[PDB]
Symmetry: D2
Subunit: 249 residues, 4 copies
């Protein structure tokens, strides 16, 4: 049988490119989404048109709450009910917006930024391992976590927490033969609505080609980590950032 | 006028050593506690006997919830109410226990306590501290071993990693206000109460420098340095106080 | 035509595994060696019998000296002489032995070999590779996943490997405008020392979380192959640990 | 009597501040110099005038050569000769200039940038340890911007990374002998003399904490901490003193 993968936030952008590349590689895929139902379905139909019964969707909010654990359990369950197995988990979904220290409430900001970026990955990891051959987890990290954007403390805290989870889970799941790694983009798909003049400011900062990563470039690193070529690699985070993190102020 | 400091979890162990040593340096202190009522009030009496009117207690649960922000605001407010100022915040309080990935508390409670005390409360206290705002600074108690974690401590480790991120992000953001933000990262220090002595020595034997744990006073010493005039250009730094433990391979 | 790669210390162990895998991916290869003449020529012979005129050898001491620059220059020239191009440089050659701080070789000689092979020669080879550029160019440095938790009494080796991290970052930054990527691969425990006894080997094996075994040479080569491939076209200044989780294990 | 310290490149700038501060703390000191004999003696004069026979000078080139070992033995020797003991080694001396990948020969650049910055610390460390209750420690002057290097400064960067490696390996290896080994990592301090005045402001404005460079004395403060009894459990730690500069993205 073909292996199966869960990709969170898979409807658009980087998660979309990861789901596609996984599918092309021979995986059956669960496309998780929160709001982008139409995008998620059309991806699934396209993939199912390539190969019948190889893609399903799964809706869930990943914000931190007393139901998040149940939600994460269900995401993993959906892979097993659809495909009879779950070989790969890709923690891709992410909230990202500034939270200055000095119109959502603070507790909502915490729930959203820490929930999506750290806690949901942790709950998904627990459910993935408990329901368990090349098993692996890939967490989407951030190459700029030690040189953060001003006034993004909660986001940055969530991405640091994810690094800790990657390391902690790699150590703890290694006896079960589940590898746990990360991919850390620098600047990738810029917001659609961000002005070209602003996009160019970011672009210019990147040493390797003065451009942002495509979603496919990020996906390429994910494909490597889940592949047979990375069978000894666990607890590693590969930056895919064109040297951006090497550039001083 | 004497400056004032908030120390979280200051009733016992390292937080107490920190509050004691700030006091001895000239600070008025808010001793925050959750459960350790007796010990809290006892320390404040000791300090107040030494110099009257220089110590208060403040009770608060630092578990994440929709009212954690109000509790954090309150801890800071208590310092202004007692002393008219708040110059130093020490984020010391911490929950610490295993949370295995593969199987009495629900997971949602484990998340609330470990991520709340170790990371979210620090963030909220930082926000409140900065909003109410001389040599201002915050010191976060981090963990020297965060990249070589204890097995089955994923949520604790995640909390401490988040605290590093907070240390860096708040140092950057609060620098224009003249608030410095730094960390102190113990290795093995005061060893948990429910621990055997064969097991204590096991851990002691791993430490290159003197084959022993840090005293609480040794941790406090680094806190004292970071808040002092000798650290005025230091921000976003984490000082490991680990006796070389983090350098030892498996 | 087929791209060409230089692999340093490629006669045996991990360098051979890298040269072989680059060859199987369709590269022409320079097999650099120092003392291992028989093993180097034998590997080129194997590779040549597989596709002719696709492998040469190149002898050079990579100890630091006033002639180390010329020697590194000549290694790169060997690739242009044999193949007309040089697309990939793998800095694999490495000296490895204790240098205790509280104490056959003089200390001068220790510094020359451990800092020379592990750091200075990579720098000089990087310079020569970049200067000779007259496509998908990259350099891969063989680093060490355990550089922040070092073996007792290996200060000079550790200093060299840390310098190599510094090179990887500095060269990635400086060479990116020229389209040359520079990355590292950091093994934990892989092929154990020839001179090591089995009992000692198993002590090391038992520390690895993922499988309680060392990395195969092939598993190291796999990451090298990833970094030079078009699947890594936006990756520069990254060091990929291939350590089975060993660097995560506390004392 | 009183403890003794060796500070390398202590004639000027950061090394002088370190020497002066150690002296004020009550150390007797060896002021190492290569070129700056006048400055070295002038500083010795100022310190002996303060406390009689508490400062001596020592000449040595710290370029890498067949004689560096002998030179490093001498520096440590002169401390034992003058003062009968050697409690502290500060590896401060350092060369700094670009070495583009695409004047001096390369091997001179290597000898200076790797030699002075990394090899001489390693040899001084050996001699210091060989010639050994006490509070013995070594402090290495590192660089906070090591992971975000200046364009075309590869050899310099290699040397400072090697210095981190030495700090770690020596902390591990000497911990059994009660010798601590730590680092202090400045960001932008006293800028190069030849550097334009407009170019200097460019850098000052990047620093989060106060849009200014560290004074030499601020660097020295961190050294003082690390050698003090307040850091007796600290080894293998590197303290950044950079005013947050290393946290700022491109
Ligand atoms: N793009 C870049 O330059 C960089 C990206 N990264 C990391 O890469 C990963 C992918 O990046 P990118 O594609 O740009 O991400 P986006 O910001 O586009 O978000 C991806 C998806 O996350 C989902 N998501 C957001 N909030 C929630 C929530 N509360 N519950 C559930 N799902 C939620 C959304 O699903 P839906 O649309 O269905 O609601 C969204 O489509 C992320 O983890 C990100 O942090 C890191 C560095 C830079
Ligand atoms: N001890 C060591 O070896 C090491 C410690 N550290 C770090 O150093 C710091 C101090 O260590 P240590 O003294 O051992 O800490 P403790 O484990 O003794 O805990 C400190 C205090 O935190 C408080 N706390 C726990 N949960 C809560 C909560 N929900 N709400 C409010 N307060 C709470 C408790 O207050 P109360 O008693 O009033 O209930 C407790 O006494 C911690 O942040 C720790 O992570 C780092 C690594 C090594
Ligand atoms: N093996 C492991 O477990 C680990 C390996 N690594 C790194 O991976 C890489 C490959 O490891 P491995 O295959 O074990 O390496 P080896 O120790 O087997 O050395 C590889 C080659 O280095 C060459 N070499 C040594 N000294 C010199 C010199 N003075 N001049 C020129 N060449 C020299 C030798 O060539 P010749 O035989 O022709 O003389 C030798 O075959 C190295 O960079 C190493 O540090 C990192 C951590 C763990
Ligand atoms: N300046 C800054 O802002 C920064 C400082 N640093 C580090 O801080 C430390 C002190 O910096 P700073 O005061 O600017 O250093 P300098 O560049 O001014 O050099 C300090 C001293 O080193 C000595 N020295 C240089 N080359 C040699 C050599 N070949 N042999 C012997 N001695 C030599 C000189 O002594 P003499 O005059 O007697 O010839 C010189 O005065 C260094 O380790 C540096 O790398 C790192 C980051 C930035
Ligand atoms: N889920 C997401 N996580 C991240 C993390 C980083 C970035 C990113 O780098 N975006 C472009 C750079 C940037 C930085 C700051 C702002 Cl205000 C806008 C854009 C974008 C995203 S989207
Ligand atoms: N609030 C606290 N945070 C920490 C962090 C680390 C340690 C520690 O390292 N303790 C000694 C090692 C250890 C680990 C787990 C247990 Cl159950 C006992 C001892 C102890 C504590 S207490
Ligand atoms: N050129 C080489 N560089 C390295 C770097 C590290 C290792 C390694 O970690 N080997 C296994 C551990 C080990 C410990 C002590 C010794 Cl005497 C040998 C091997 C082995 C090698 S071989
Ligand atoms: Cl030369």
């Amino acid at each position: 049988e073909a292996p199966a993968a869960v990709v969170t936030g898979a409807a658009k952008r980087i998660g979309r490119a990861i789901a596609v590349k996984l599918h092309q590689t021979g995986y059956r895929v669960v496309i998780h989404y929160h709001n982008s139902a139409e995008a998620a379905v059309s991806l699934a139909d396209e993939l199912n048109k390539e190969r019948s019964n190889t893609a399903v969707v799964c809706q869930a909010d990943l914000t931190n709450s007393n139901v998040l654990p149940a939600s994460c359990e269900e995401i993993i369950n959906s892979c097993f009910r659809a495909f009879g197995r779950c070989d790969v988990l890709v923690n891709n979904a992410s909230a990202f917006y500034p939270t200055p220290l000095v119109g959502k409430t603070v507790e909502t900001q915490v729930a959203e930024l820490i929930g999506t970026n750290a806690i949901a990955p942790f709950l998904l990891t627990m459910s993935f391992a408990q329901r368990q051959s090349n098993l692996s987890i890939v967490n989407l990290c951030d190459a700029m976590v030690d040189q953060p954007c001003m006034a993004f403390s909660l986001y940055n805290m969530g991405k640091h927490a994810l690094v800790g989870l990657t390391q902690s889970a790699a150590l703890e799941l290694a006896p079960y033969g589940i590898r746990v790694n990360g991919v850390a983009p620098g600047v990738s798909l810029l917001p659609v609505a961000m002005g070209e003049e602003e996009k160019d400011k970011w672009r210019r900062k990147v040493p390797l080609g003065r451009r942002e990563a495509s979603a496919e470039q990020i996906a390429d690193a994910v494909i490597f980590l889940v592949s047979g070529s990375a069978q000894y690699i666990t607890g590693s985070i590969i930056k895919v950032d064109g040297g951006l993190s090497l550039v001083h102020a």
